[PDB]
Design a protein around this ligand. Structure first.
Ligand SMILES: *C(=C)C1=C(C)[C@@H](Cc2[nH]c(/C=C3N=C(/C=C4\NC(=O)[C@H](C)[C@H]4[C@@H](*)C)C(C)=C\3CCC(=O)O)c(CCC(=O)O)c2C)NC1=O
Ligand SMILES: *C(=C)C1=C(C)[C@@H](Cc2[nH]c(/C=C3N=C(/C=C4\NC(=O)[C@H](C)[C@H]4[C@@H](*)C)C(C)=C\3CCC(=O)O)c(CCC(=O)O)c2C)NC1=O
Ligand SMILES: *[C@@H](C)[C@H]1/C(=C/C2=NC(=C\c3[nH]c(C[C@H]4NC(=O)C(C=C)=C4C)c(C)c3CCC(=O)O)/C(CCC(=O)O)=C2C)NC(=O)[C@@H]1C
Ligand SMILES: *[C@@H](C)[C@H]1/C(=C/C2=NC(=C\c3[nH]c(C[C@H]4NC(=O)C(C=C)=C4C)c(C)c3CCC(=O)O)/C(CCC(=O)O)=C2C)NC(=O)[C@@H]1C
Ligand SMILES: *[C@@H](C)[C@H]1/C(=C/C2=NC(=C\c3[nH]c(C[C@H]4NC(=O)C(C=C)=C4C)c(C)c3CCC(=O)O)/C(CCC(=O)O)=C2C)NC(=O)[C@@H]1C
Ligand SMILES: *[C@@H](C)[C@H]1/C(=C/C2=NC(=C\c3[nH]c(C[C@H]4NC(=O)C(C=C)=C4C)c(C)c3CCC(=O)O)/C(CCC(=O)O)=C2C)NC(=O)[C@@H]1C
Ligand SMILES: *[C@H](C)[C@H]1/C(=C/C2=NC(=C\c3[nH]c(C[C@H]4NC(=O)C(C=C)=C4C)c(C)c3CCC(=O)O)/C(CCC(=O)O)=C2C)NC(=O)[C@@H]1C
Ligand SMILES: *[C@H](C)[C@H]1/C(=C/C2=NC(=C\c3[nH]c(C[C@H]4NC(=O)C(C=C)=C4C)c(C)c3CCC(=O)O)/C(CCC(=O)O)=C2C)NC(=O)[C@@H]1C
Ligand SMILES: *[C@H](C)[C@H]1/C(=C/C2=NC(=C\c3[nH]c(C[C@H]4NC(=O)C(C=C)=C4C)c(C)c3CCC(=O)O)/C(CCC(=O)O)=C2C)NC(=O)[C@@H]1C
Ligand SMILES: *[C@H](C)[C@H]1/C(=C/C2=NC(=C\c3[nH]c(C[C@H]4NC(=O)C(C=C)=C4C)c(C)c3CCC(=O)O)/C(CCC(=O)O)=C2C)NC(=O)[C@@H]1C
Ligand SMILES: *[C@H](C)[C@H]1/C(=C/C2=NC(=C\c3[nH]c(C[C@H]4NC(=O)C(C=C)=C4C)c(C)c3CCC(=O)O)/C(CCC(=O)O)=C2C)NC(=O)[C@@H]1C
Ligand SMILES: *[C@H](C)[C@H]1/C(=C/C2=NC(=C\c3[nH]c(C[C@H]4NC(=O)C(C=C)=C4C)c(C)c3CCC(=O)O)/C(CCC(=O)O)=C2C)NC(=O)[C@@H]1C
Ligand SMILES: C=CC1=C(C)[C@@H](Cc2[nH]c(/C=C3N=C(/C=C4\NC(=O)[C@H](C)[C@H]4CC)C(C)=C\3CCC(=O)O)c(CCC(=O)O)c2C)NC1=O
Ligand SMILES: C=CC1=C(C)[C@@H](Cc2[nH]c(/C=C3N=C(/C=C4\NC(=O)[C@H](C)[C@H]4CC)C(C)=C\3CCC(=O)O)c(CCC(=O)O)c2C)NC1=O
Lengths: 20, 248, 177, 164, 104, 177, 174, 177, 164
């Protein structure tokens, strides 16, 4: 249930880097 | 990696619906809704705290970490926010020894027991360089947390079958108990502290209390001693046609 | 963990000695016969799936109450866990034959194994019997005296490797007894 | 420790795998390179008194401020505990040439060493002045062979870069 | 040879000349000198009496007294004849403390 | 954890009684000398890294078998762990000096300290020396009887606090013996 | 639970030499002041016990009358002996910095012995209180008829310390 | 005659042996720098009655629990027995300085010493503290850096002998550790 | 920024709680020491150029092996950087008196300091030979108030106990 192609806090990063 | 106990004799691990909701661009997750939400929060409260039985005027100080959890649906960030709380250090840091605090971080956040003295002493190397928040975020941002739980499920005690040491399964069974068992019953006093630093093992009745229903909890004990003698050199001989060969 | 070269330098560290030419003639013959040590461990890992299933079902043959109601190899749930366990034991004694020192078998596999088995209910006399079959399977592949499966080696004796691996299989019985 | 054999059997243990063919290809290289580093080991074993005698006084020639009062090399027992702590390091280079890995250095001689030398006011620049003296004192066809000198000097400057 | 308390006593004689310079390494059983220990045991017992910060972090044990039969009269029970009229007199001088307990 | 004011509360909660004026004179005197308690805490934490360096290396002087091969303080990894422990005993005593109560020293530092040091194999007759060398150095700066590092205090009697710290350092010595 | 000189039946002298005093003088805070306060008492030990028990008579002349306790010149000399012994332990108690040997060897049972022999307790409380008020003035060098030669500074810490020892004597016979 | 100087020790009784003026003149040309070594052992044994009087009293000077009631240098006779064995150690070290080797010291004075002190309950953590005071006196008296007493020596350097007599005092400290 | 006011609001936010009148009393004590630790603030800030001229040469008085060619302070641009690297600490001690806490030394001067002086081989024994000068140069009725010399000599040996 972990689904290996996944992250946790670069998911936080790139939504506040594509806006930059 | 077969593990005959795990989804057979226990339950299935709880958690969020999927991890593909983060790549969805009109949502953040499959939105659970407040009956499907709070029964997952009941399982994080029963796992990070033991069965601590937190009151209504102790949950009010955790009001802010749930309100972020029902918008940002990451489970790992909810566990990180609950371990830096006052309600986590007033139960597991304040009146305990140092290896009692360390052995409960392996229970509450990994579902296993510590495998070594060298692994245990490196957690006190992180206490010297940042306090207790350096221990907690290094467990959470580890590789072992990423490839077992992730952002999706609660960190549960997992019967793996293919443990990297056999002693790791023993210290997991001492740390969790039955369901009528919290972790304030010792007065401080780490249970695994003598066996980590010496290299011995645990007591068979303390492990078989915490085994599930249907797994021969206790039988197999001969009425002589329960551990091994390291100094004993037995003679184990093999029969060949002529005589008996003691390949020692 | 240690290997056969690390075992010598922790003996000299108790005396603060230097590993000189008196102590080095055991290590100069470990590298001299070091081709045969590699030649013996792919004689074992090439036959390891046949070795486990013969040793576990050969233990069922001499003890048919393990597969009756109340035996601890009864259902598919318990029989696959017994087949997994004998593959773990054969894996750790192939590490120990490769290193030349039984450190990694004794702390990772065998330390605490006796207390798992008297909490899960595993019979230890028949578990010793499955290890003692695959000890005899391992000495027959090394000395090339198996009835099927003649492998292609070079000529000489491997009789000190066959009794080194027989002592690694004897430590498994001594740790769960 | 850390060596060529403990690398490949703990890489195999974390995957749950048997010893494969790539793991036995590695320990063939432990067989082929062993005659170099067991000649540099048994040369440093029978010559360790004179190579720590020369490494000891090259420390105090570069740093004669240690024999000022109040410093590290104050009296003769503190000179004698300086020659002992560089004879400990040449023992571990002999242990690393025998094992064939950096294992005995970084957990008997480097682990904790920055903490104890900072408290006890021992300068690390005096420790690296001794070890770098023996790396230039080696010459190629007299003291060992040409390939034993590459093994012996590579364990010397692994110790230098760990203290720097 | 352990408990016999013998030891090589070395004596050097030197009168400056060359034919005066013997060394005599003879063997003597050394003896426990009973009397000069009281110049060490008593002076350290009043060195540690006057230490303010070695009477704490070095605290002595709780020594029981002798069997003094509280006869019943307090002038024999509380103040016996071995400690009758005894008091310390301190006699300071240059680099000397010099307490003394005598009957005054 | 508890402090000097909270021990008076939890003793009178056990009797279901309000804290009257007959129990306040031990506490009203505590805030009267409370400035010179704080004046004597930072004479310990400002000299702390020299005290642990002296107390460990004086334990090496009295017991020279700690640095023999097979000694407990032999290699560099074991030497730095001994320096880290004496800083921890100094840290928890300097909480209990500040709090005026030996609660927090007892159940975070001394809780299971004896069973840890047996399992590691730390010698208990040398580890009581290192808490007693620095016991004498902690009654040094309170009584201002230091050889080097004279510190500028205000004049008066501090032998109540000097005797209180000597109670706290032997609470460690009664715990690991 | 008396003090470190528990050498009863053995020794009795126990001086301290010069270099071991340097191990002691660098071990007491105001140890130079404490030695001068002891020497300002024990140089004047004869005049202190003489003026105290005469001033006790000078406030209470009923002890010289027949029936009084300090009749029959032995008993006046026994009061002079008891006046010395109360002074010599307090002059030790200023030196050691504690009243542990004073409360165990000198003051223990002093209430029960003085009522056994018929010693008036209230007059002896006045006798220690005169000896208390003298030694304050000897230590601070406000003694009228004789001034010592001390170095400059204050000794009001030790003068409050020695009044605490003399109040223990007045408590023990009250 | 140096081989005959071990004859007077081995008989377990008293025998006196000496060298002449012409015999020592052959001895100081045979061995290196022997005029310093006879000056080394004369500087110790001229002050040997003060060296054990200061070291045993210096052991009480920082550890007054030995003369505490319940200690081991209590009751009148154990202090006299401790002063005898302090003087036993000083004559074997000064003979080891004179003979040039520790070969008479470790077998005739330190062999069996560790088991004898733990049989009697002698505190061996304080006897190493009494040896290190005698080590600190000895390197002062060899190098003439003794503050309270200065002898008359010919000029030169004696730091090789002072490192030699320091190293014999660690051998006493290594056996009782 | 560890100080008196942040640690009573980051232990109520970490408690998830309003500030009651226990951490209102915790900065009543901030009023009382503010008259004394701001006395030592501008007494350093008007005198800072002389007290690093008087402390910075004392490491070049103690350690004259630093001026040797091949060592650390071998030319004047390294000397001029060295007086800059001790005027940084006297700027940072000036902030630790202002904020009432160890924050600006903890995160700007000792944070990661033990790796940069190791890798560049700048000896830290000469850094705390210079803070130990100003710990032994202050005479308290002349230089400041009696309580300001407590607080100046509490943050100087806080640097010494953190750099060694
Ligand atoms: C407590 C106050 C106390 C001590 C501390 C301890 C004294 C002590 N002294 C030394 C050092 C020396 N002792 C020496 C012996 C003597 N000096 C003499 O001149 C005569 C011959 C003889 C007996 C008195 C010598 C020569 C030294 C070295 C020089 C020096 O004086 O320092 C030590 C060991 C080192 C040290 O800690 O100073 C000790 C422990 N006794 C006490 O009562
Ligand atoms: C009646 C006949 C009579 C008294 C009543 C009593 C008066 C008295 N004096 C003092 C005070 C002191 N006595 C001192 C002792 C001495 N002074 C000296 O110089 C020599 C050394 C020594 C013996 C004569 C000292 C120093 C004092 C304090 C100074 C002062 O004058 O106050 C007291 C105690 C104080 C009090 O509580 O009143 C008394 C009662 N002596 C008589 O002869
Ligand atoms: C897989 C078939 C391998 C192989 C393995 C070998 N097995 C060897 C010996 C052996 N096997 C058994 C079990 C067998 N006997 C039974 O009675 C039953 C059923 C009840 C079974 C399955 C036993 C008991 C033994 C002997 C062990 C002992 O003596 O204690 C063996 C040894 C050499 C030999 O047989 O001569 C090997 C190599 N054999 C193969 O060739 C394939 C590769
Ligand atoms: C005993 C187990 C055998 C037997 C063994 C011998 N093998 C000998 C040499 C040998 N084996 C190999 C292959 C091995 N070396 C490797 O490096 C790797 C994998 C990377 C493997 C599998 C080699 C290369 C050699 C060396 C000879 C050659 O190069 O062809 C050998 C010779 C002695 C020696 O040189 O060590 C013996 C005796 N022969 C037997 O009869 C029994 C059954
Ligand atoms: C740190 C540099 C402090 C400091 C602390 C003090 N330590 C004191 C005494 C003391 N030191 C040692 C270790 C020393 N003695 C040895 O024999 C050896 C070698 C084997 C060493 C390194 C010991 C054992 C003691 C004894 C303590 C006792 O038993 O009483 C000391 C003097 C006594 C005191 O005042 O506490 C101090 C002040 N010294 C300093 O000046 C800085 C601040
Ligand atoms: C005994 C250990 C000492 C000694 C102590 C005394 N200190 C006294 C007063 C005192 N100390 C300070 C500074 C202190 N207060 C604080 O709040 C802080 C931390 C922020 C510290 C370091 C102050 C402000 C005071 C009060 C007045 C003053 O002296 O500045 C003191 C007098 C009692 C009192 O006023 O409470 C004593 C006896 N003096 C000694 O000689 C020994 C060695
Ligand atoms: C009441 C004055 C408002 C109103 C409030 C609602 N807020 C809801 C969710 C929510 N609020 C916050 C902000 C607050 N919580 C925090 O944890 C922090 C920072 C520490 C802050 C400032 C957050 C982050 C969230 C989301 C977390 C969550 O899902 O609960 C909310 C729930 C909406 C819902 O049911 O989905 C309400 C009703 N809304 C109003 O209409 C009035 C004006
Ligand atoms: C000489 C080139 C040095 C120097 C050295 C000094 N070292 C002192 C003590 C010392 N050395 C070590 C490390 C040593 N122990 C080990 O087990 C190993 C590796 C196997 C090593 C290299 C330690 C742990 C210690 C402290 C404990 C002890 O005395 O054994 C020392 C005495 C310092 C003191 O008394 O505190 C000196 C003087 N001095 C120099 O001048 C350069 C730097
Ligand atoms: C004088 C200022 C008093 C006074 C004194 C008398 N004391 C008499 C006897 C006595 N008192 C003690 C107790 C105390 N004196 C000591 O010498 C010691 C020990 C060091 C102590 C604790 C003792 C021991 C004695 C002697 C009796 C014995 O040894 O058993 C005394 C004689 C009474 C009599 O003979 O009947 C007198 C007169 N009495 C006064 O009137 C003033 C106030
Ligand atoms: C209070 C009772 C007095 C007072 C006492 C002070 N004495 C001071 C210094 C001092 N006192 C002595 C004599 C004393 N010290 C000893 O070691 C011995 C016996 C061997 C005795 C009798 C000496 C030798 C000194 C040192 C003088 C010098 O250095 O030359 C003193 C100054 C402070 C100090 O040095 O600690 C004081 C305050 N003075 C008074 O004002 C009252 C009346
Ligand atoms: C003194 C600084 C010590 C200490 C010493 C005690 N030793 C006691 C008896 C004793 N000591 C030795 C060793 C020494 N004496 C010899 O005759 C020889 C051999 C040449 C040596 C090396 C022996 C052998 C014995 C007596 C054993 C026996 O006779 O069977 C002793 C008396 C103990 C008692 O009477 O209970 C003491 C007090 N004790 C200390 O506290 C310091 C550390
Ligand atoms: C080192 C501990 C001293 C020191 C020693 C030196 N002594 C030197 C010459 C010398 N030594 C003696 C006496 C010695 N020889 C004996 O036969 C006996 C009797 C047993 C003794 C005690 C004499 C008479 C001389 C000659 C002096 C003269 O010419 O008048 C010496 C010079 C070198 C050498 O001759 O070996 C040294 C260095 N000097 C020191 O500085 C430390 C304190
Ligand atoms: C274990 C490792 C080990 C070493 C590295 C050497 C190190 C070493 N070299 C020399 C001693 C020497 N080494 C050399 C060799 C050279 N000098 C030069 O200038 C040339 C660059 C170089 C030629 C290759 C010479 C010429 C001497 C004698 C002079 C000297 O003392 O340097 C000595 C003194 C004892 C002796 O002469 O043998 C020692 C210990 N020996 C060892 O046992
Ligand atoms: C803000 C921090 C600060 C300091 C730490 C001091 C540091 C300092 N001290 C002195 C300079 C001096 N300081 C003193 C004072 C003393 N010397 C002693 O030996 C006495 C014990 C002590 C009295 C308290 C004396 C006598 C001099 C002149 C002698 C000298 O040190 O060169 C100077 C030179 C200019 C001056 O006199 O001020 C400086 C910068 N000044 C500061 O501005």
């Amino acid at each position: 249930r972990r689904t290996v192609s996944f992250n946790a806090r670069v998911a936080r990063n790139k939504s506040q880097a594509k806006k930059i | 990696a077969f593990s005959s106990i795990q989804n057979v004799l226990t339950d299935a691990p709880l958690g969020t619906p999927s991890a593909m909701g983060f790549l969805d661009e009109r949502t953040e997750k499959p939105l659970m809704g407040p009956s499907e939400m709070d029964e997952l929060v009941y399982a994080v409260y029963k796992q990070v705290f033991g069965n601590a039985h937190i009151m209504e005027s102790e949950r009010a100080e955790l009001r802010d970490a749930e309100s972020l959890f029902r918008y940002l649906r990451d489970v790992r960030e909810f566990v990180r926010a609950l371990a830096k709380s006052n309600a986590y250090t007033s139960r597991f840091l304040q009146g305990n020894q140092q290896y009692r605090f360390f052995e409960l971080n392996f229970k509450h956040l990994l579902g296993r027991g510590p495998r070594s003295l060298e692994e245990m002493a490196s957690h006190s190397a992180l206490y010297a360089e940042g306090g207790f928040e350096a221990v907690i975020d290094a467990i959470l941002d580890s590789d072992e947390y990423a490839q077992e739980f992730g952002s999706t499920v609660v960190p549960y005690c997992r019967f793996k079958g293919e443990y990297p040491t056999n002693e790791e399964f023993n210290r997991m069974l001492v740390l969790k108990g039955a369901n009528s068992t919290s972790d304030k019953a010792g007065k401080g006093r780490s249970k695994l502290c003598y066996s980590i630093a010496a290299g011995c093992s645990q007591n068979w009745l303390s492990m078989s209390k915490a085994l599930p229903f249907g797994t021969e909890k206790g039988t197999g004990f001969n009425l002589i001693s329960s551990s091994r003698n390291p100094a004993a050199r037995p003679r184990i001989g093999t029969k060949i046609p002529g005589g008996v060969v003691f390949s020692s | 963990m240690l290997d056969a070269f690390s075992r010598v330098v922790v003996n000299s560290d108790a005396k603060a000695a230097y590993v000189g030419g008196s102590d080095l003639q055991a290590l100069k013959s470990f590298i001299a016969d070091g081709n045969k040590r590699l030649d013996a461990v792919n004689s074992i890992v090439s036959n390891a799936s046949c070795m486990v299933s013969d040793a576990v079902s050969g233990m069922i043959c001499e003890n048919p109450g393990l597969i009756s109601p109340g035996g601890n190899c009864y259902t598919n749930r318990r029989m696959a866990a017994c087949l997994r366990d004998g593959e773990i034991i054969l894996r750790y004694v192939s590490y120990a034959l490769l290193a030349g020192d039984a450190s990694v078998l004794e702390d990772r596999c065998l330390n605490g194994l006796k207390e798992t088995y008297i909490a899960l209910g595993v019979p230890t006399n028949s578990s010793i019997r499955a290890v003692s079959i695959m000890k005899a399977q391992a000495v027959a592949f090394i000395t090339n005296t198996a009835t099927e499966r003649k492998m292609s080696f070079a000529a000489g004796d491997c009789t000190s490797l066959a009794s080194e691996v027989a002592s690694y299989f004897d430590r498994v019985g001594a740790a769960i007894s | 420790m850390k060596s060529v054999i403990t690398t490949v059997v703990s890489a195999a243990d974390a995957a749950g795998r048997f010893p494969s063919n790539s793991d036995l290809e590695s320990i063939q290289g432990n067989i082929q390179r062993s005659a170099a580093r067991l000649e540099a080991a048994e040369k440093l074993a029978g010559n360790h008194e004179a190579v720590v005698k020369e490494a000891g006084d090259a420390c105090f020639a570069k740093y004669a401020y240690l024999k000022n009062p109040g410093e590290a090399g104050e009296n003769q027992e503190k000179i004698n505990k300086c020659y002992r702590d560089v004879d400990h390091y040449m023992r571990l280079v002999n242990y690393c040439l025998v094992v064939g890995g950096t294992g005995p250095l970084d957990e008997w001689g480097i682990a904790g060493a920055r903490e104890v030398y900072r408290t006890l006011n021992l300068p690390t620049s005096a420790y690296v002045a001794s070890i770098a003296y023996t790396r230039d004192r080696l010459c190629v066809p007299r003291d060992m062979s040409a390939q034993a000198g590459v093994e012996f000097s590579a364990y010397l400057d692994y110790l230098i870069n760990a203290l720097s | 040879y352990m408990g016999t308390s013998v030891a090589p006593e070395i004596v050097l004689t030197d009168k400056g000349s060359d034919m005066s310079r013997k060394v005599k390494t003879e063997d003597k059983k050394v003896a426990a000198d009973q009397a000069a220990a009281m110049g060490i045991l008593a002076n350290m017992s009043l060195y540690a009496s006057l230490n303010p910060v070695k009477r704490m972090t070095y605290k002595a044990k709780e020594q029981a007294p002798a069997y003094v039969k509280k006869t019943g009269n307090p002038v024999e029970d509380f103040y016996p004849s071995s400690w009758r009229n005894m008091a310390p007199v301190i006699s300071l001088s240059a680099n000397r403390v010099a307490v003394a307990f005598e009957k005054i």
